[PDB]
Design an enzyme around this catalytic site. Structure first.
Site: not given
Ligand SMILES: CCOc1cc2c(OC[C@@H]3CCC(=O)N3)nccc2cc1C(N)=O
Length: 289
Positions: A34, A36-38, A52, A145, A150, A163
């Site tokens: 995102g 704001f993070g990986v 995250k 957002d 999301n 998010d």
């Molecule tokens: C962080 C919360 O959970 C996740 C996010 C993921 C993702 O996020 C993309 C953007 C940035 C952060 C957001 O919420 N969307 N892309 C792919 C797989 C994801 C799997 C998960 C999971 N396995 O919970």
């Protein structure tokens, strides 16, 4: 009003192979990113989890605190579940239940060679995402957002909105305009904060579900997906011209019903858009028999 688990930073560092930023497809741990993070795949207490790691420092800390605060209040079948957090070490981390099927954005693009979503799955995802937004609006929260990145997808392809760092609990104006440009309502681009803006963004998500196209593509005409509504209204094109060809089970009637909901969500005047309850009702009637 939930109370969450507190993880050690070094445990999260350990179970994600030292935050291995290489994609999972080449032996790393990175699932996504995102602004704001990986997001990393990890394994804590025999359970697969997503970590995250957040990357001004003051604004980032407030979004970390807001995510925890919103998640403590909002818990629903269609909202991603927060398991815990980490703030003792180097970086701020948020730990969630693992979503084996990633984001709706990645599944619509078939990222990494995943099979395309059927029309049957897309209808359940649209319904689930609307149910999650309904829960948020019922609990007086504006997401700010809403977008396909999301909307996460679990082991049964159930939609899980994610998010909440920009969510606002409560038309009102802000001096810090935030969100994703390609999904934002005109009034949100001007600084207004209203749940009607989430409806508009959800309309762009519905066009992504019908077409399989990203919300913005600088090498496409039109660049912004939301502009196809005007092409269809001016009879320059039909929704059939834009239907995702990567499905074999779409039917004109239910596709036209989802498009009608998306068109209504995308009204430029915020007061002419349906509320989330009406959107839920229309999406339920779309699959009823
Ligand atoms: C962080 C919360 O959970 C996740 C996010 C993921 C993702 O996020 C993309 C953007 C940035 C952060 C957001 O919420 N969307 N892309 C792919 C797989 C994801 C799997 C998960 C999971 N396995 O919970």
């Amino acid at each position: 009003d939930t109370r969450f688990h507190s993880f050690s930073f070094y445990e999260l560092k350990n179970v994600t192979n030292n935050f291995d930023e290489r994609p999972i497809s080449v032996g790393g741990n990175k699932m996504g990113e995102g602004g704001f993070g990986v997001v990393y795949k990890g394994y804590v207490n025999n359970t697969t989890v997503a970590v995250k790691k957040l990357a001004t420092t003051e604004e980032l800390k407030q979004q970390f605190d807001q995510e925890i605060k919103v998640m403590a209040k909002c818990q629903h079948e269609n909202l991603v579940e927060l398991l815990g957090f980490s703030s003792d070490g180097d970086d701020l981390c948020l730990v969630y239940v693992y979503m084996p099927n990633g984001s709706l954005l990645d599944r619509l693009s078939c990222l990494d060679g995943t099979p395309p979503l059927s029309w049957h799955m897309r209808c359940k995802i649209a319904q689930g995402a609307a149910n999650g937004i309904n829960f948020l609006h019922e609990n007086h929260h504006i997401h700010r957002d809403i977008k396909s990145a999301n909307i996460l997808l679990d082991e049964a392809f159930t939609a899980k909105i994610s998010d909440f760092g920009l969510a606002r609990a409560s038309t009102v104006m802000t001096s810090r305009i935030v969100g994703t440009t390609a999904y934002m309502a005109p009034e949100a681009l001007r600084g207004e904060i209203t749940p009607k803006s989430d409806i508009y963004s959800f309309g762009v998500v519905l066009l992504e579900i019908i077409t399989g196209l990203p919300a913005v593509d600088e090498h496409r005409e039109p660049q912004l997906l939301l502009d196809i509504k005007e092409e269809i209204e001016d009879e320059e094109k039909t929704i059939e011209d834009y239907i995702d060809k990567k499905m074999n089970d779409a039917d004109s009637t239910s596709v036209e019903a989802m498009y009608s909901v998306a068109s209504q969500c995308l009204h430029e005047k915020k007061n002419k858009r349906p509320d989330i309850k009406k959107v839920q009702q229309l999406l339920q009637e779309m699959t009823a028999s």
